[PDB]
Design an enzyme around this catalytic site. Structure first.
Site, short mmCIF file in Angstrom:
data_model
loop_
_atom_site.label_atom_id
_atom_site.label_comp_id
_atom_site.label_asym_id
_atom_site.label_seq_id
_atom_site.Cartn_x
_atom_site.Cartn_y
_atom_site.Cartn_z
N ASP A 134 0.64 3.42 -1.70
CA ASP A 134 0.23 3.74 -3.07
C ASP A 134 0.04 2.50 -3.94
O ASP A 134 0.19 2.56 -5.15
CB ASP A 134 1.17 4.76 -3.75
CG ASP A 134 0.62 6.19 -3.70
OD1 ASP A 134 -0.32 6.52 -4.47
OD2 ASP A 134 1.12 6.99 -2.87
N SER A 135 -0.28 1.38 -3.32
CA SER A 135 -0.75 0.24 -4.08
C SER A 135 -2.11 -0.10 -3.50
O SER A 135 -2.52 0.48 -2.49
CB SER A 135 0.22 -0.93 -3.99
OG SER A 135 0.51 -1.22 -2.64
#
Ligand code: MG
Ligand code: ZN
Ligand code: ZN
Ligand code: ZN
Lengths: 84, 263, 65, 56, 33, 46, 56, 132
Positions: free
Chosen positions: H4-5
């Site tokens: 999730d980056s």
RNA sequence: GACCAGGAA
């Protein structure tokens, strides 16, 4: 009121916490320019000096183990097994 | 003719479609990288602003000024300001541009890159003139004014490269392809039914022989032959992006030997 | 808020092309997918750059001092 | 409960995390900015005396 | 006849100036249309 | 020659100093602005 | 929140640039951490004794 | 870009992707104490008080203000004010922040007080811990 | 600084 050495019943091995406190304490003391009982063979970090004092069982400390009732066994870091 | 080869397929002011042949892929790729990242260019790098009455903020404008392509032909005979000996900058290491603009008209007044003017001395080298490819010759629309809208600022362009900021990138996209019939199996085609039907053939399929299925897989094979296309923003003419890149890369590989030697 | 100079993705110069694209629309009555192409914008990163730009400055302009 | 069993404390820092494929398991990347703020009290000793003077 | 305090007016309500205001009126009024 | 302040709406320059009461000339309004430093500021274009 | 022993663990510092704490991807789960914007606290021991406690 | 980056194109960022303006507007006034015991917008120095902010007063003009164009940062003093006693009150820029004075505004409170608002623009460029 | 209110991994 302290148990005689011939009647000691605790582990004859040294506990994670005993060791961490032993290493920590010496390293503190070494950091405070206390006498080192080993050849710092180019060593300079008080922990590593202490890890080295411990490895050669030349740490002149004693763990006093307390029982729930208040009595206790004194053990030399000399005599404690360090398979830990 | 020698080692690696070229054939040019099309050419313009700002586009060179060609074919590299007889080369390491790594080499072909390095050129690609260099062309993008390491060929020197002039771009405005400092902006002192005397007056701004615009709807656009000082630095917002400043930033755009960095993106206007400037004539970078003779850039190699301008010094990197970092190495020039003056405190700050001089004529030897920098071009000075000036922009004054005022909403004279009632209708909205336009500030284009053409409205830049070189104050510094060029020592007569091709440099600093804003690139204009524009049909009506206005170049980048920098900004818009209404009436008492005045823009008065001053630009110092310096030598630099894309690694430091993309504003110094002499080339836009660089098209790079090889082995259009996946004969090296360097990729494994995703599909629903037919890898052939779903995936479009490349234009370059015409420039290599189709694999012909009655054939054992050639593991000996290796990628040489690369269909490239270089596109220049304009600060340097296309052909030069290719050459200078080749040269720039070489200079690198050289500096290595040279350090190897002071060793 | 005013046309970007240069497309983010590839870096192609784009800020000159704005008024043309607006004219290819109004005067020539071309549609966008051609008007863009007439301006030699082909890699779609450059297409989106113009096609999806909202030139707000023209509103900002309408206020006074 | 909020002053004794817990406290706000000195020598502490916090910031957004992100992960690294290139750090080793047991290390943590600290921003130079925080490294420069956060302090360790080291005692002057012959072991460190020169290195210590160097930092000062 | 007599004064009795002040009523906060909702913007664009009947009673607010901007209600009847035109686009260029607003821009002139420093108010976003 | 030289201003201290600027009228908000009508935008006439207003060169006043403290203890003067804050208000434009001919313009009724009381808003008034500062007008940038002559000390030209500079930016890298990055 | 810190519901585990494992929710606070000792790490080796590696001073680095940029403003995030960077950590090894595999120690992601015992912390419960994901890089969708979550911050993390770091405390720094002050005694020789306490660092021992940490590292040991 | 694990977990999730995301990875973002630096070249693109330069060219202007996802950049933002950011403005903050600090504000103040002189508060009368009934019998015309008032405060003052001014640049102060030493003079019997010695109780004043620990950053640069020098960006200040004589009306205790900054002219809009100047770079500020740290706890540079953005507004100068004073209080009497029977001889500080100045408003430094947010410690954590930095930027450029953008618009300064001198006017009156519904009463008759010197009332001032100082806006400061910074550009924020997409950096590593930034969320999207 | 109390206190109230609103919004986040
Ligand atoms: Mg999370
Ligand atoms: Zn020079
Ligand atoms: Zn593009
Ligand atoms: Zn007026």
């Amino acid at each position: 009121k302290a148990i005689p050495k011939d009647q000691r019943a605790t582990t004859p091995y040294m506990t994670k916490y005993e060791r961490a406190r032993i290493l920590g304490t010496r390293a503190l003391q070494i950091s405070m320019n206390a006498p080192v009982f080993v050849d710092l063979e180019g060593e300079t970090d008080p922990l590593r000096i202490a890890m080295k004092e411990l490895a050669e069982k030349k740490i002149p400390l004693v763990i006093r183990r307390y029982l729930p009732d208040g009595s206790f066994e004194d053990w030399s870091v000399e005599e404690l097994i360090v398979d830990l | 003719e020698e080692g690696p080869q070229v054939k040019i397929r099309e050419a313009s002011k700002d586009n060179v479609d060609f074919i590299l042949s007889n080369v390491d892929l790594a080499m072909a790729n390095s050129l690609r990288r260099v062309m993008i990242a390491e060929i020197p260019t002039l771009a405005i790098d400092s902006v002192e602003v005397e007056t701004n009455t615009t709807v656009l903020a000082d630095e917002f404008i400043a930033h755009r000024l960095g993106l206007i392509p400037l004539q970078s032909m003779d850039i190699e005979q301008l010094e990197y300001s970092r190495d020039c000996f003056c405190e700050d900058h001089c004529d030897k290491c920098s071009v000075v541009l000036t922009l004054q603009a005022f909403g004279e008209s009632e209708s909205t007044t336009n500030v284009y890159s053409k409205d830049l003017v070189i104050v510094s001395n060029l020592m007569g080298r091709n440099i600093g003139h804003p690139i204009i490819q524009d049909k009506e010759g206005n170049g980048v629309l920098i900004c818009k004014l209404r009436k008492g809208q005045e823009l008065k600022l001053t630009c110092v362009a310096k030598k630099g490269i894309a690694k430091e900021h993309a504003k110094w990138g002499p080339a836009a996209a660089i098209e790079f392809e090889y082995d259009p019939w996946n004969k090296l199996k360097h990729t494994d085609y995703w599909y629903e039914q037919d890898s052939a039907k779903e995936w479009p053939q490349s234009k370059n399929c015409e420039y290599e022989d189709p694999p012909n299925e009655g054939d054992p897989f050639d593991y000996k094979a290796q990628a040489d032959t690369f269909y490239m296309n270089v596109e220049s923003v304009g600060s340097i003419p296309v052909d030069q992006v290719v050459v200078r890149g080749i040269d720039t890369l070489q200079k690198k590989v050289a500096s290595i030997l040279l350090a190897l030697t002071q060793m | 808020m005013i046309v970007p100079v240069r497309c983010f993705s590839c870096g192609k110069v784009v800020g000159d092309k704005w008024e043309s694209y607006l004219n290819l629309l109004q005067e020539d009555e071309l549609d966008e997918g051609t008007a863009l192409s007439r301006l030699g914008l082909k890699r779609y990163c450059c297409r989106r750059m113009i096609l999806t730009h909202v030139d707000l400055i023209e509103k900002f302009l309408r206020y006074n001092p | 409960r909020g002053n004794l069993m817990g406290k706000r404390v000195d020598f502490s820092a916090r910031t957004v995390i992100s992960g690294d494929p290139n750090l080793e398991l047991d290390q943590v990347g600290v921003p130079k900015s925080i490294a420069k703020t956060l302090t360790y009290p080291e005692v002057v000793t012959p072991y460190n005396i020169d290195r210590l003077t160097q930092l000062v | 006849k007599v004064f009795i305090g002040r009523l906060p007016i909702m913007l664009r309500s009947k009673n607010c100036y901007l209600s009847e205001a035109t686009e260029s009126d607003l821009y002139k009024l420093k108010e976003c249309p | 020659a030289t201003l201290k302040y600027i009228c908000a709406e009508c935008s006439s320059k207003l060169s006043l100093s403290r203890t003067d009461a804050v208000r434009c000339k001919d313009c009724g309004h009381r808003i008034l602005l500062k007008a940038r430093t002559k000390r030209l500021v500079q930016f890298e274009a990055r | 929140p810190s519901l585990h022993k494992m929710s606070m663990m000792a790490h080796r510092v590696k001073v680095i640039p940029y403003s995030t704490f960077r950590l090894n991807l595999s120690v992601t789960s015992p912390y419960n951490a994901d890089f969708d914007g979550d911050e993390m606290n770091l405390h720094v021991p002050q005694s020789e004794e306490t660092r021992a406690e940490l590292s040991q | 870009n694990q977990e999730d980056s995301m990875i973002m194109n630096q070249s693109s960022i330069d060219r202007g992707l996802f950049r933002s303006l950011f403005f903050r507007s600090y504000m103040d006034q002189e508060k009368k104490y009934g019998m015309s015991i008032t405060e003052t917008f001014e640049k102060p120095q030493r003079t019997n008080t010695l109780r004043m902010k620990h950053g640069t007063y020098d960006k200040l003009d004589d009306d205790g203000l900054i002219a809009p164009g100047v770079r500020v940062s740290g706890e540079d003093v953005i507004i100068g004010k004073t209080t009497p006693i029977s001889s500080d009150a100045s408003t430094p820029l947010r410690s954590t922040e930095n930027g450029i004075v953008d618009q300064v505004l001198v006017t009156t409170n519904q009463d008759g007080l010197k009332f001032v608002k100082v806006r400061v623009r910074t550009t924020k460029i997409p950096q590593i811990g930034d969320k999207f």
